[PDB]
Structure formats: structure tokens, C-alpha cells
Amino acid sequence: MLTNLVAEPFAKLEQDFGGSIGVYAMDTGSGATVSYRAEERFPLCSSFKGFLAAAVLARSQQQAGLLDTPIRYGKNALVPWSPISEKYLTTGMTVAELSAAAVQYSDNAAANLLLKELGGPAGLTAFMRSIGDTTFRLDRWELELNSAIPGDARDTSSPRAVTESLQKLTLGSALAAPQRQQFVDWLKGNTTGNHRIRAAVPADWAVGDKTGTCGVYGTANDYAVVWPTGRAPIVLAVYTRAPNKDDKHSEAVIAAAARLALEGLGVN
Ligand SMILES: O=C(c1cccc(C(F)(F)F)c1)N1C[C@@H](c2nnn[nH]2)c2ccccc21
């Protein structure tokens, strides 16, 4: 009955935001879920970079030494918003450093370099299929994947699919034991999400998260694995979009939807 408990709060929040909010939250030590537009497609924006790092980790379980491989790249690999890879242009970075850069700073050149190693957007989509995710699709590279065009299913997933895949990758069996904790650690070190899901959780909770911000169509998001102290983890995804290209995204709307979700689950 949790979903019904939050139906009207969510609807009014999305009315004042002026767009659509999609939320899926899951209590793993209870089974409880909260859903609002959880099956609708939303643009992933940079939030695909979390799964990108997971796909790299998965591949590292077969290709020994993959994480320490040095990757050298030219100025032409640089793309707007590559704050980490800009600084190692003259030296190269390892696959693990690119992965951490993609997760924790949304580094765009790092994301494209890793996508190339994985076989492009189809390679990443393939990895997500391999863990049971039939919704996720990545179709383009940075920065074209951010167009967030209304009705366009390219480079989208659903809040529900994002949460289910995140749970499999951070808490379940989709990744081997060291890779899973490495993924968690990268998510925990994220620097871009202080005003989204992290803003809605108590200071003593551990949090790993990945953000996405398309820059257009009021489209922005965050997904997170959240550890209440001494309790079982909560996994959740908050995705927004709006009808007009010039509509602005709201970090506060995302934090508000996270808090609503956690209160709906009864654990806030
Ligand atoms: O251009 C930006 C950026 C940089 C600084 C400040 C801001 C502000 F506007 F917030 F102040 C935005 N970024 C930030 C980064 C991101 N990752 N997840 N959300 N945004 C990202 C990913 C892909 C393309 C561009 C970008």
C-alpha cells in the first residue's frame, strides 16, 4: 500500500516542478517498494556512467589486469566537461582511473574512452541485458546522448529498471565480490550529488550515488544505494523531465522526491 500512500504528494510535487518525476525505491531488508511513474522511460544523461563503470568491472573479472591498463588519448578525445581527463592528457590514465572519473565527476572524455573499450553503446546495453535488464538502452556517445527529446526512447531507462540493476550490481550477485565493493566505493566517492539524494538522507547514513543532468528539457536524475545505520540498505532512483527544451531541472525536486520515497518506505 506504500505506493498509494505517496501517490498524491508526488503528483503535486511534479505539478509545481512543471514536469514529470519518476521514482522507484526499494527496502531490501523488508521487500517494501515505492513507485511513481517507475516504468516510464526517462533520459539517462550521465547516470549511465555508473553502469558503464560496472560493465568495466564485470569485464575485469575475465580480462585479468584490465583495471590497471594505461589508456593514452589525444586532445581530440577531450569533450566539454572532462575535468579529470583534461589534467592527465599529457600522461594517460588507467582504466580504473577513467572509471572513477566517469562515476565521481561525470567525466565525459573518460566515459567515451571506456565506451570505446566496451564496444560502444551497444556493448554497454549488452552488459545490462546480461544482468537481466531489458529496459536500459544506450544508443549514442557523449554528448549527443543528452538531447532528452520528448518521446525519444534512445539513451533512456526506467527508474524501476535502474534501481533493480543497481541493487544487483551493488548488493546482489551481478558482480564478483571485490568488483562489487569497488563499484560501491566509487559510488560512495561521488562528488556531484550533494544536492540530490544525499541531501535527503541523515548525515550518519552511508551513500553511494550517480547523477545525470542533460541540460535541456528539465531533465536530471540521481540513483543511490543508501545504508541506514545498522539497518538493511535502501536502493532508489529519481528521474525528472519536462515538456519544454528551455525548462530547467531542479536539484531540490530530486531531493524532495527522495525524501518522499524514504518516508513512503517508512524509513526516514
Ligand atoms: O557542465 C557541467 C557542470 C559543471 C559545473 C557546474 C555545473 C552546474 F550547472 F551544475 F553548476 C554543471 N556538468 C556537470 C556534470 C554532471 N554530472 N551529473 N550531473 N551533472 C556533467 C555531465 C555531463 C555534461 C556536463 C556536466
Topology, pairings included?
Elements: H1 2-17, E1 20-27, E2 33-36, E3 42-43, H2 48-60, E4 70-71, E5 93-94, H3 95-105, H4 108-118, H5 120-130, E6 156-157, H6 159-170, H7 177-188, E7 206-213, E8 220-227, E9 234-241, H8 251-264
The protein binds the ligand O=C(c1cccc(C(F)(F)F)c1)N1C[C@@H](c2nnn[nH]2)c2ccccc21.
The ligand O=C(c1cccc(C(F)(F)F)c1)N1C[C@@H](c2nnn[nH]2)c2ccccc21 is lined by residues 46, 81, 106, 108, 192, 211-213.
Q: What does this protein structure show overall?
A:
Helices cover 37% and strands 16% of the residues. The protein is of the alpha+beta class and 268 residues long. It has a single domain (1-265), classed as Beta-lactamase (3-Layer(aba) Sandwich), CATH 3.40.710. A 5-stranded antiparallel sheet has the order 2-1-9-8-7, sandwiched between helices. Helix 2 runs antiparallel to helix 3 and helix 3 crosses helix 4. It is globular, with a radius of gyration of 17 Å. Bound molecules: the ligand O=C(c1cccc(C(F)(F)F)c1)N1C[C@@H](c2nnn[nH]2)c2ccccc21. The site of the ligand O=C(c1cccc(C(F)(F)F)c1)N1C[C@@H](c2nnn[nH]2)c2ccccc21 has 8 residues, from strand 7. GO terms for molecular function: beta-lactamase activity. Belongs to the class-A beta-lactamase family. Its EC number is 3.5.2.6.
